[PDB]
Structures are given as C-alpha cells and as structure tokens.
Amino acid sequence: AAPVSEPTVARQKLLALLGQVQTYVFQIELLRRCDPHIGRGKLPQLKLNALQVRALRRRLRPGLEAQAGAFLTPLSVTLELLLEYAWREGERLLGSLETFATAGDVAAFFTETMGLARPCPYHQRVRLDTYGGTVHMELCFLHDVENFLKQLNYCHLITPSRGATAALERVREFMVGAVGSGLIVPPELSDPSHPCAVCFEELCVTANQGATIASRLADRICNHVTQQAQVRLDANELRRYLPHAAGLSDADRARALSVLDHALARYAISELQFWLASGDRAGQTTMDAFASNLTALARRELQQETAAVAVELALFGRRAEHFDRAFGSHLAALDMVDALIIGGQATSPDDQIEALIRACYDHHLTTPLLRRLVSPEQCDEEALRRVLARMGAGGQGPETWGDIATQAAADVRERRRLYADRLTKRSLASLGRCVREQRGELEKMLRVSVHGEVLPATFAAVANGFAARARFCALTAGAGTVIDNRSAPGVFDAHRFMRASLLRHQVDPALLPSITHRFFELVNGPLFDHSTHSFAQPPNTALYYSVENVGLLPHLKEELARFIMGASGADWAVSEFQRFYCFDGISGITPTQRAAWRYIRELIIATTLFASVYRCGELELRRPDCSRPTSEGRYRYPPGVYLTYDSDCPLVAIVESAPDGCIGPRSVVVYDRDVFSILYSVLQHLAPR
Amino acid sequence: TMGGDALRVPFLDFATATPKRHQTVVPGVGTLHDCCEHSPLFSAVARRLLFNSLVPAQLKGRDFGGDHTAKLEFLAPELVRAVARLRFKECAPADVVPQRNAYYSVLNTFQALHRSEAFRQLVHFVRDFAQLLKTSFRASSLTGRTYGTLELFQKMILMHATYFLAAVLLGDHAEQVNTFLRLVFEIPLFSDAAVRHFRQRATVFLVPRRHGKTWFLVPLIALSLASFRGIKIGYTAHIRKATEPVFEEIDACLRGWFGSARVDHVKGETISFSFPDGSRSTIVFASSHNTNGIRGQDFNLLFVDEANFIRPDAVQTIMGFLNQANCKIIFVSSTNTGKASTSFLYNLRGAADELLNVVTYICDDHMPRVVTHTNATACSCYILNKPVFITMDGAVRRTADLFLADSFMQEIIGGQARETGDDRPVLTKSAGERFLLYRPSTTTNSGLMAPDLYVYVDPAFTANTRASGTGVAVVGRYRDDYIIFALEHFFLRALTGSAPADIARCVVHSLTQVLALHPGAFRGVRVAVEGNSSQDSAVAIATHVHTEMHRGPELLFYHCEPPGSAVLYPFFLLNKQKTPAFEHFIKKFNSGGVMASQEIVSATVRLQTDPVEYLLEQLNNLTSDDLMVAVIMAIYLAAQAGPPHT
Amino acid sequence: TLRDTIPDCALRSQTLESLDARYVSRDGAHDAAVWFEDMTPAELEVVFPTTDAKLNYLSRTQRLASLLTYATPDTACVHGELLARKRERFAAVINRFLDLHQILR
Ligand SMILES: [Zn+2]
Ligand SMILES: [Zn+2]
C-alpha cells in the first residue's frame, strides 16, 4: 500500500502550486488598489513574483500543451487560466508601478490598474464555423460562455474538428480575462437571471408540482456560475489586531492604541422618502427602521474610517491614499441605491441584509405569515396533513363632487380592507414564495460574489470530445495495413452490390427500440453524458438535456424523437456513392443538422441489416468521443466501426486492432466515406475466419 | 478495501510566506493562504479529488478510464514528467514541526470515515445497487444495450431514500457525506439547497401507468434492508391482495442473491434480514392497517405504494406516522392518465412547495405535449406495427391521423386541441402572483407618481352579449413603472337611447374617483377612445366625456386623422401599434414593472370579483378582451409615441 | 541546496525582461525553487487585518470601479446597459420589499 502512483503525487503538487498562484493573484488584486507609494515598497517582491510566474511556465508549457490536446480536466483548465492571468496582470501592474515614480500622480495610477480608461476588454468573436454555414457569436458575459459551449456541444456532429478546437482557443482567451481571476467577478460580466446548465438539472431532479420546467426556469438565480462566499466581518476588527502586528516591536504598539482610543472618543439617508411609501406615516414604519439601521451602519463606517486614518498616521507617519480614498469624492455624491449596492468597507454586505431584515421583521408583524418563513417545511407538512384529513372523509346620477367623491371613498374603504384580508387569511402560500424569492434576489445582489466552478468544467467537458475525435483521426493514420477507400477506382461495384444486398430486407420492426437508442446515443454530444454514469439514464433523457439547454424550437423535437419511429428503401439510404458525410448542397444550422441525422440513421440501419443478413460480422457501432485515457498515454480503441463525424473521412472500420487494445502493426483499419463500401470491406475480412 | 491513492499521500511541505494568523489547511494538500477558501475554483477542485477516492470503482461510470476517473484526475505523461522535476522550497524546521501535525490531523477525519461501518453501510448499499442494476433487475447471483437505465423518477426516488437514510444513520458526518453522495450520483456543482431538498420528509410521487413502478421498489427495499442495520421500512398498499405479490418479489431476490438463513419470513406480515453479529433490520408491513404499526420505533420510510385512492380507514395510522420524529413518508402513487388528476393528492400543489412531483408527458396545456416528448420512454412506443397500408404522408399528417392522445390512450376530449398550432402562455405565473399581491399604496406615495393620467376606453356598443363589455383603464407612471388606478368592464343596459353617454358617465365616474383619491397629483389626463368599432360612436363618447369633465388638471384627447382625411377626430384607431404595445407590456409585466394601486377604483367590477383578480384572468388568455386591451393600450400610451393634444 | 530566486537575484535596479533573460531563460539556469513572496503591504494589513476584511474591501472597490468606468463617442457597450438594468431592478426590488412588510402589519 506504500507505492503511490506518480499521477497522484503530481496532482497534489499541482494543487499546491494552484494554491500558491491563487494567493499571488489575490496579492496582485490587492496591490491594484493600495497607494502607489506603498506599492513601490513591494516593487522588488512583485518583480520577484512575476519572475517566479514566468519561470513557472516554460516548464508546464509543454506539459499543458500535450494536455490540451489529450483530455483536458477541470484541474489543468483552472491552472492554465490562473497561470495566464498571473503572467498577465502581474506584468501589467508592474508596468503601471514603474510608470509611477516618473509622473508621480495617484489619480492616474488608479485609472491604469483598475482600468478606468480601457475600451472594455470583455468582448470576443467565436465564429463557430460549422458545416454549411459558419455562424458567429460574441462572448460578452459569463453566461455567454455557457450558452456557447452548450451550442458547440449540440452542434458537434456538424462542426469540423480543427474548426472547433480553433474556436475554443478563442473562448479560453476570453475566460482568461473574465474568469481568469477565480476570486472575484466584476459586476459587468455576471447576469444571475440567465440559468446555467446545472440549474436545469436541479429543476429536473427536485420536486415539481405541475409547472413544467419551461416555466420554472424563469424564476431562478442559478447560483452556480457565481457564488456568494458568505463573508463575515466583526465590529472592532481594527482594535483586535492592533496590539498584534507584523513589525511594531517597539512600544509604538501602545501609543498607536492610545491614539486609536483618543480618536474613537474624539449613506444618503435623506433620500429614502422619494421611494414608494405606504400606510400611516405617524409612528414607527419600515422606512424609519431602515433609516435607523443605515444610520447605525454609516456611523460604524465613519468611526472605522477615522480610527484607521489615526492609526496609519500614528504608526507610519503618512496618511495613505488607497483606492477608496483617492476616489473618495465619488463615494460622497452617491444615490441611495448606487451607494447601497457598493459600500461598506468597514461593515459587511451581510450587515446590510441584516439591517434590512431587522427593519422588515418586528414583533408586530403577525402570528401567521411569520412562521412559514422561519420554517417553510412545517407549512407544507401541515398542508399535507390537511389534504389527507380532507380526502379521508341606479338612477339619480349626480354631477357635483359631494356624491362621486363619497361613493369613491366608500369603494376604496371596502377595497383597502378586501386585499388586506386577502394577504392575511388567504394567499399565504403565494406570499411565502414571493418574500423568499425577493430575499434571494436581494442577497444575490448585495453579497460578495466570487466565481463558480461551472465554466472551467463544461469547457473541459466540451473540449475533450473534439480533442478525442482529432486524436482518433490521426492515431489511425499511423497503423498497420490501411485500406483507405476514399479513392474509388473499382469501389462502385462493391458499393452497389452491398447496397442491393442490404436494401432487399425489411428493418425487422422488433428491433426499432434498439435502433432508436443507438440513434439517440450517436446524436447526443459529449457534455451531457447522463448515459455512462453508474446510475445511467435512457439516451433519450441524455439527449433531452443536451437539446433543451440550448433552446431548440419545439417543432424540431418531434423530428428528433419520431425520426426512426418510421423505418422500404425510402428514408433508409440517403448517401450518394462517395458523399456519405458531405454537406455541399445544404446551408444553415437546422437544415444542415437534419442532413446529419439522416446519415446517422442510414449508418445505424445499414449496420443492423448487415448484422442480420451476414451474421459473421458483429459491427459494434462506436464513437471516438468515448474511451477516455487510462493512467498514461493509452486509449485502447476496441474493434468496431467509428463514425468520427468528420466530413473528410467519416467512417473508420477497425476490424482487427490488437489483443490488448492499442492501434499498432496488427491493426488493419479501413478508411471510407461511404457506408456500404465499409460494410463490404468488413465482410471481406471477417468472413474467412 | 483501502480505497484510492488520494487519501494516503505524503506531506509535501512546500513553503508559505503568510503568517499563521491567516493560513488554512485544505485536506490532501498542505497549508495555504486563507484566500484559497473563498475561491470555489480551488476549494471545489482540491475537495473533489479527495472524495473521488472514497467512491468505489463500480460507481465511476461505464467508460471512465481503466485505473482512475479520467474526467477528474488525469495528467498527461508529459505533464507528469514536467512537474516531477519541479521542486518547491523546504519548510523551516520550527514551522514544519506543527505543519505536519496539522496536515496529518486534518486528513485523519477522512481515513476515519473510510473505516466507520456506519458509512460502509451506505457505500455498500450504493455499490450493490449499481453493480446489481448493471444487469437489469433480475434473478442474478451478484458475484446492443446490456446495461439497465433508471428513468428520471426512478432516480429521484433513490435520491430521496438515500440522502435521508444517510442524514439519519450518519449525523456526525453531515458534510463528508453530502459531497460524497454528490460524486456517487454524478450530481456535483449542485448548490446545498437543491441537495438539502432531498433531506426533507413526505415527498409525494405521481407516476404514469406502469413505468416500472413496482419493478423498482422491490430491489430498492431488498438492498436497503440487507445493507443498513436498524431500520423498519413500513410498506402499506391498497387492498392487501396486492401486497403479497410484493412479499414474493422481495423475498425471491432477497433469498436469491443472498443466503436463506438470514431471510426471516412470516406470511402476510413482517420480513426480517439478520446480520452475522446480533443485528436485524426488518420491513414490517403496515398493510394490516389495524395494529403492529401504530407504535413507531425506527420506521423512517413508510413506503406507501398507491395513494391514488387511499385505503379505507387507513389514513389514521398514516397520520400517526406523520407524527413520528424521523419518518419520511415516500407516498408513491400511480395516476395512469386514466384520470390524469389524482385530486385526492393533486390538490396538494395548491398550497405547498417542494412536496410532490408528477411524472407527466402532457403539460397543463395539452397542445405542447412536444415539450416532454423526447423524455417519454422509447419502450412504450408500440403502434399497430404498420405505418400505413398504402399512403405517402408526412409525419405531421400521420400523427394527426394517429394522434390517439399521442400515447395510444383516450385522454380527455376538448379544451386544448390535438393539433398544437404553436399555442403557449405569455405572462408568467410568478409575475401574475406578484401583480395580484403587491399593490403600492398610491394615495400615500403620490410623490412617486408622474403628473399625467392616461385613459383608454375600448367600447362595445351592444347589450345582452358576453363580448359586449366596454373596457376602461386609467394608468400612470409610478417611479419608472406603470400602475393601474381604475378598471371598468361595463355592460350597456339594453335599448338605452344614450349608449355613448352611458359609457361616458362610466368613465367620468372612474376618473373622478381617481382624482379625488389623489388631489392635486395630476396636471393632465389624456384620454383615448378606441374607434375601430364605430368612429361616430367613439367621437360621441369623447364629446360626452369632454362635456361632463367640464365640471386643475387639463383634459386632452388622442386624435386621429383617418386615411384620406384632413380631420383630427378624438378617437384612437388600433392597428399597427397593437403588436408593439403587447410586446412591451408582456416584457414589463413579466419583470415586475406593472402593478395595481392598492386603492384601485372599479364601480363595475366590485361585488362579484376583485378587479385585479378579474383583469388577471383576462390577461392569462394571452398567447372577451376589452379590459386587457384597454389596460395594455393605456400603458402603451403612458410609454412613448406621437403627441396627443387639447 | 536548491536555492530560491530571492537569494539568487540580489539586485533590483533593472527591468523585468533583462532579469528573465539573465536568470530564468538561460540554458544553464538550474531553476530549482518555487516560492512566492508575500506582497501584501503592512500599511494595509494594519487596517484590514482579516482575509474576509481584505476581501470585502477588494469587492467594494471592484464594484466602485465597475460603476465608474461605465458612468470617441461609442457608448454602445452591453455592460453599461447590464449594470443599469441591474441597478434599476435592485432599486425596484427593495422598493417592493419594505412596503410589502409595511402592509403585512
Ligand atoms: Zn463591453
Ligand atoms: Zn444555476
């Protein structure tokens, strides 16, 4: 049990390096906001760290290059992103610091580092470049990478290999800039309204009370491409750590505390009224409580600010001008909302939620409509008990004001009590949802959002398919006897013979489920697997996931589910002589994908009929996107007939590969476009044995 | 037996420049800065590669790489040979003394979970379930498609059972078990809310006709008995003639792939599995519905099979079980679409959340059945075994002739037709509920209102018809949103001599009330009278409104210069602007930007129904419309267009 | 043995690329250490002495910067519109969250 494999201690070493690099990126994001005169003190440290990051590549460069071309993993994707973002932002900040001490101005240093004069470097062009038509999209947001990777996953049987792994290098160039930090997400590129690919499985797996998923997916925050990090911050954090500092070995650690105590003993709240206000004004209100809480928070913030200023003055001698001070003038002229979203470097973004909840929830609210929030499970349990118990057993039209005003006053007197009794007697299940939804939509906006683990996982899951396909395309070219049949000097005869000998039999309608399954298994993409899990699911579900995420028109799901439901020679053979996977006379995205579904159906039904007629062959219809690599550099492609989805040389028949799995000198393989010639070449081999 | 190689790694004491006041210890790796814990991109990779060792090899998948889960832990040989000659620093002695202790101690709580039999019970349960479903549930010994598949609900039920049994038998490890069951169900990236959802009790399932309903619960029980120790799964049902089949199908396999000595069986009553060390777990059958089930000790499951028509006088024991502190009444059911609404249970969706789940193949609207089409299983797709005798028809016309409720059934005729014809809802239920419930009080927040009122009247000039109602809306801007102040759905008295004045008197009365409720708020009221029905009659209404209002706010009418005319008439013609108006409304309404005043005025809709509730019923027809049209158009006018005048 | 880069350089009056070509890009460079220096300034730890406190500030200033850049004449950026829409929706949501709990009393 003592010998541990090298790809296990190497993973631990890489995790340690990833932790160090994440720490370094944190320090970088910190120095982009400190006063330049203090940053210049850490100029040798920053230069040495940038040197270390530079020297960290040029060693992991060939390793990660040979990895990106063979089965990326969510480790070496985040590692690439972070080792690129460090090598970028470290040198950028170092340049911005060495530009300082020449001009000697701070307000123009926080416009270089913090990027206040850039042309918004959060745009990209993808140009998917499928067959028939090269659709192009732009990656502006974070969900716009999910919605492009899912599109490239769904349109994988239609997209060339080297035309996709060259549009993924254009996605990584954006991710390095957006999700490259891995620690904080700018509010620009984060739209929590758009659901992700893993919060669609949530609704599919959690409980739905009717309310089909197409309508449940529109009330979601998706909470996965960005998280909340639950930052908490004590009250007297400055006084706690003051008697314990890094240096300060002198008694100055006591005079600093003295000046802190002396200075301690030494939000635009006037804007709430212009918001909508209901009910009685005289007396306590929700607005009054919110104003008092925000005043307390502002007082704590001001006290912390003045104590920090006094401590920095007494300790080092110079009052530093960090980002929040050099641009502090813009923190004054701030509206209630623009200063409620941002703000609170002394308090925490959870303290604002606390100040709001303490305002909306007092002892006078109600007996009901208060317990359902503190326990949304006992409410549904009581509802289940109740359900089980119930199921067990004229004229004189006035013109002046005195009458129309009185009748309107009576009508509003009735109706103001009507809905007031609605919100209390009935409508508890609706209010218990509305409030628990608005509270979530608030906490997602106020809490510090960091980053989610979705993008560097789906990116790897998508890129691995195309990597494996391009790897199988080139690993078989170097093999034993190759029988490449893309040149047809004498193949028409053997193609037409086999096509006639196979079109003579019916599809055996007792086999239509075993064909629909192998159709939904080929058509599906590599991202949404859901069919090779330990707790597998039918391929139609693994396809429903991959086709519902990328919003597909409902008028095309019947064309997919009911494609092989009907199976004579019509709708059976679509390929011409050598144009099996050729999309020359088709443009678009959906009519270019129907032509791929047709070729896949033809291949499947031809293989079934060949197994039925010539019983000698087995014809395991496989796909190269499977067969993930073992411990090292071994792929063990078993025999069969691979589709390969490549319009250059689609069908690759591996008739006799090896007794161990790899492709070497005893691995006769047959390249061909057409399917029937492939079947004839397979017959000419497997039969005399 | 020892698991994987990820829980046995050596120290790797690289280095650290951070003070101990900050550094944290991630298990499996050394001691890193604290900022590596608020970054999920690292604390979700360094933690998944650990629990990917506890997961046995029979649960990684079917094609995952020979030796490891390649999709998580794989490094190319070049990268391994490159990081091999990478050497970190060496920790200082005074710092390596406590660092190694912290590292090897934060890892002990994992090499301690890999030993506890309480967790080995769960691991054995899941691994045996997987390996025994590999070959579909049959009489195997436990020693081209060849691998069985769990459908969606057959997996949701397994999750509801397994997460609860883990949270009950393992309480001291409620953190190392969640992020292991995540890996074992291939369900990572799943927020703790949507996984804690499985920790709740009494989650009802409504299943179609067969869908392997019974075929799945017997292996579930057989494996949840012979794996865990100390649970008594109650299994009620309908009339007990159906429970003995469950007896036989449980005990045949439970004695099949196990030893008969541990199979304790009494006819018509409890079944018990015994373990080689003084342990026994049973499946005591509460199907008797009389006794032996009232006193609950360790039930925790209460697998109620068919709650469609509840068993007579058997709800008392169920309600008593609901009082048990650790019971999760699974409440399986079967609505075979023969009724399509087990309203004894389906009424639960009214006031409850995350309680019941329906496995349906047709939505509420029976037209978008294609919504759940690719999800319907392929095994249940059999037809007459002949497409057509002699016919060349496309799949559309074929499915029209071969509809038969799209599932060979005889589903309810009427309502939503058979040809879908692109029919869908438009306003979300969630926005609708908020429209009903959150109503700003305008009389006390008048500072938030714009100083202009907009009114639209959509007249109908007939009586004694259901579509003869005149719609009136008066709306305004509230912050940057739109708020409704008044609504009318007005019905002419038959054979009046003054229909336009009757309509005018109705709108004037509405306006007046709105004006009186918000005195001095409005500088202008702008009035549009739809003239599509009758231009002359629309003009007459405007004239009466004009005159009556003459008894402050200025009154303006929208004017229209009909084609070929130079005259400006005080009516509004609804044509090209309808689609933009509706489109904008739908977007605004759905995002929470249209609301009703808490003191909304309505003389015509007051005694029978709430005016906002009534409007919403009309609005939910978007895919008699006088009110909906007036509201949508009044708002469009308050939005932006050409100027209306005096 | 296996010395670090900080005992190697010892001189900090140069540009980064010269040091790269002289110490990490030479063929004879042994390159047998990985140690990231501590870059946080003590003048910043003494005021934000907590990783949570150093992250709340690092997020507040990030939000401020993302507000300032989006508040010659292109102005046609989707991020400015996204920030505007988010701010408007947040204001409108807090609006109907204080009043709703005022009514419930
Ligand atoms: Zn932009
Ligand atoms: Zn999500």
Side-chain angles (χ1 to χ4, degrees), chain B residues 151-171 173-237 239 241-296 299-304 306-310 312-341 343-366 368-405 408-410 412-415:
Chain B
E151 200 203 9
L152 202 39
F153 83 97
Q154 296 193 41
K155 195 191 177 68
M156 303 158 61
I157 278 182
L158 197 147
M159 272 190 255
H160 273 91
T162 298
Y163 267 106
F164 192 78
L165 261 51
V168 158
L169 267 45
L170 290 92
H173 318 265
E175 212 151 346
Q176 294 85 345
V177 149
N178 290 343
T179 86
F180 164 79
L181 295 190
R182 278 179 189 174
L183 281 184
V184 89
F185 293 148
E186 269 307 286
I187 195 189
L189 321 181
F190 248 76
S191 41
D192 275 314
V195 155
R196 180 215 309 156
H197 171 284
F198 303 140
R199 221 160 307 275
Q200 80 185 20
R201 55 167 87 171
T203 77
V204 189
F205 278 74
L206 282 157
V207 157
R209 172 59 258 178
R210 181 50 178 263
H211 271 44
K213 191 184 139 85
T214 303
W215 168 68
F216 169 64
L217 264 77
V218 296
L220 212 172
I221 284 305
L223 275 318
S224 159
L225 262 191
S227 56
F228 300 107
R229 295 164 186 162
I231 41 179
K232 55 163 91 163
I233 308 117
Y235 182 87
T236 84
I239 166 74
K241 293 321 151 194
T243 303
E244 306 144 278
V246 180
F247 275 53
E248 310 320 322
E249 62 201 309
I250 287 182
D251 291 5
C253 52
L254 200 148
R255 191 182 294 102
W257 53 56
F258 284 130
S260 183
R262 302 166 78 176
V263 193
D264 182 327
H265 185 23
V266 306
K267 294 331 180 153
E269 267 301 322
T270 84
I271 318 173
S272 287
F273 201 95
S274 277
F275 308 91
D277 50 318
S279 319
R280 179 151 51 256
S281 206
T282 167
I283 186 167
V284 305
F285 275 89
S287 192
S288 276
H289 299 170
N290 324 295
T291 41
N292 313 268
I294 286 182
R295 269 279 277 108
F299 268 87
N300 322 325
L301 276 198
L302 181 47
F303 264 137
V304 192
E306 316 209 29
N308 177 25
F309 292 124
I310 206 59
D313 72 31
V315 311
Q316 310 98 41
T317 166
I318 293 189
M319 261 282 317
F321 265 133
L322 260 82
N323 196 27
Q324 193 165 339
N326 274 117
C327 209
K328 172 180 185 156
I329 313 100
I330 274 298
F331 264 163
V332 189
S333 157
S334 186
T335 310
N336 322 270
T337 67
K339 313 149 271 302
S341 155
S343 277
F344 276 7
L345 277 180
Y346 191 81
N347 53 27
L348 195 155
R349 71 172 277 199
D353 269 282
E354 316 186 299
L355 260 197
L356 85 98
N357 35 46
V358 284
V359 179
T360 167
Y361 291 151
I362 325 177
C363 320
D364 180 35
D365 323 281
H366 290 65
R369 181 179 180 274
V370 317
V371 160
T372 65
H373 193 349
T374 299
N375 200 9
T377 327
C379 90
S380 95
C381 84
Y382 304 139
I383 317 155
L384 163 74
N385 271 16
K386 171 172 260 184
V388 296
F389 321 99
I390 37 183
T391 317
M392 294 300 293
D393 285 4
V396 203
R397 279 287 174 85
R398 299 279 188 85
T399 299
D401 277 81
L402 182 44
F403 202 86
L404 192 45
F408 208 78
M409 320 307 256
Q410 200 75 306
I412 186 167
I413 169 68

Side-chain angles (χ1 to χ4, degrees), chain B residues 436-437 439-444 446-447 449-473 475-477 480-483:
Chain B
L436 199 58
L437 177 63
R439 310 189 188 183
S441 173
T442 50
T443 55
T444 62
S446 58
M449 293 157 12
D452 291 295
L453 233 35
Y454 293 84
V455 6
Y456 193 94
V457 63
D458 184 9
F461 302 99
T462 65
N464 306 331
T465 291
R466 293 178 179 83
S468 66
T470 285
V472 179
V475 310
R477 261 173 79 95
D480 58 350
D481 289 341
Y482 304 99
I483 189 144

Side-chain angles (χ1 to χ4, degrees), chain A residues 119-123 140-141, chain C residues 70 76-80:
Chain A
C120 195
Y122 294 134
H123 294 101
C140 279
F141 302 137
Chain C
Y70 307 110
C77 187
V78 204
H79 303 280

Side-chain angles (χ1 to χ4, degrees), chain A residues 150-187 189-218 220-264:
Chain A
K150 288 183 293 175
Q151 193 83 214
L152 169 60
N153 153 58
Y154 162 67
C155 296
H156 71 118
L157 44 63
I158 204 193
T159 289
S161 161
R162 74 165 176 269
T165 55
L168 289 169
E169 188 249 341
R170 216 62 45 191
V171 158
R172 184 188 160 278
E173 268 184 1
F174 167 86
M175 267 166 45
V176 167
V179 68
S181 164
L183 197 34
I184 209 94
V185 44
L189 51 109
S190 93
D191 200 277
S193 87
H194 282 247
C196 48
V198 86
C199 79
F200 175 92
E201 312 186 13
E202 296 203 347
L203 316 190
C204 290
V205 173
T206 68
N208 60 317
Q209 303 161 349
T212 174
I213 182 156
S215 89
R216 275 200 298 136
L217 199 49
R220 193 105 182 79
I221 325 284
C222 99
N223 219 329
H224 301 102
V225 86
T226 46
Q227 302 199 350
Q228 297 175 22
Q230 271 106 30
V231 151
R232 72 178 205 82
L233 180 46
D234 299 329
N236 255 322
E237 271 295 353
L238 173 52
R239 181 178 170 78
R240 275 190 178 92
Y241 288 81
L242 186 43
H244 299 281
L248 275 57
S249 88
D250 203 338
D252 61 337
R253 200 126 42 87
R255 76 173 158 95
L257 197 51
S258 157
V259 187
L260 185 144
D261 288 290
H262 193 63
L264 271 183

Side-chain angles (χ1 to χ4, degrees), chain A residues 231-275 277-361 368-403 405-406 408-414 416-418 420-421 423-487:
Chain A
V231 151
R232 72 178 205 82
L233 180 46
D234 299 329
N236 255 322
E237 271 295 353
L238 173 52
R239 181 178 170 78
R240 275 190 178 92
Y241 288 81
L242 186 43
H244 299 281
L248 275 57
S249 88
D250 203 338
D252 61 337
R253 200 126 42 87
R255 76 173 158 95
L257 197 51
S258 157
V259 187
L260 185 144
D261 288 290
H262 193 63
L264 271 183
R266 179 176 290 181
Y267 309 160
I269 207 54
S270 88
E271 212 147 353
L272 282 182
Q273 292 184 341
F274 307 150
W275 292 4
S278 93
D280 188 316
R281 282 291 300 255
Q284 185 277 348
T285 44
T286 58
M287 294 300 293
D288 155 81
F290 198 47
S292 93
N293 303 339
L294 290 200
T295 288
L297 293 187
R299 178 178 298 118
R300 188 189 309 142
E301 209 284 332
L302 188 133
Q303 281 191 1
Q304 166 71 252
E305 183 43 37
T306 197
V309 168
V311 161
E312 303 202 81
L313 264 184
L315 272 182
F316 318 103
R318 144 182 175 75
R319 164 199 176 271
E321 307 193 16
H322 291 76
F323 185 83
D324 56 289
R325 305 172 193 169
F327 278 40
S329 87
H330 299 247
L331 288 315
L334 232 45
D335 326 287
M336 247 307 299
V337 163
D338 274 300
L340 201 61
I341 291 177
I342 78 192
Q345 90 186 12
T347 71
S348 43
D350 207 339
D351 272 28
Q352 289 157 18
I353 317 296
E354 215 76 60
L356 219 170
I357 283 194
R358 274 194 209 264
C360 293
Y361 299 85
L369 70 90
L370 214 74
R371 299 295 187 174
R372 61 191 312 104
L373 283 83
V374 312
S375 160
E377 313 86 57
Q378 277 44 72
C379 195
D380 66 49
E381 193 83 342
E382 147 186 306
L384 171 65
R385 307 183 87 153
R386 178 166 305 274
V387 157
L388 212 47
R390 171 186 170 93
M391 74 172 266
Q396 180 214 330
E399 194 91 86
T400 35
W401 299 83
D403 322 80
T406 319
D411 272 28
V412 308
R413 205 163 175 265
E414 316 175 40
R416 290 241 180 82
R417 184 199 55 97
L418 256 174
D421 292 28
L423 270 70
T424 316
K425 257 84 73 171
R426 309 182 286 124
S427 90
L428 276 315
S430 158
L431 190 127
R433 292 195 305 259
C434 295
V435 68
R436 289 190 308 115
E437 174 162 330
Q438 304 281 138
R439 183 174 164 196
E441 192 168 350
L442 271 197
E443 311 192 10
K444 190 87 170 68
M445 179 99 51
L446 283 104
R447 288 168 193 262
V448 44
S449 69
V450 278
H451 255 308
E453 56 197 276
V454 183
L455 291 187
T458 87
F459 177 90
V462 149
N464 282 349
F466 300 90
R469 176 197 312 184
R471 189 181 74 242
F472 175 72
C473 280
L475 208 144
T476 51
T481 36
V482 73
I483 319 196
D484 165 81
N485 282 339
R486 284 168 290 177
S487 51

Side-chain angles (χ1 to χ4, degrees), chain B residues 622 624-640:
Chain B
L622 261 187
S624 202
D625 70 341
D626 56 316
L627 295 174
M628 183 194 73
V629 167
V631 164
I632 293 182
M633 296 319 297
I635 285 167
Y636 170 81
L637 268 35
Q640 186 173 355

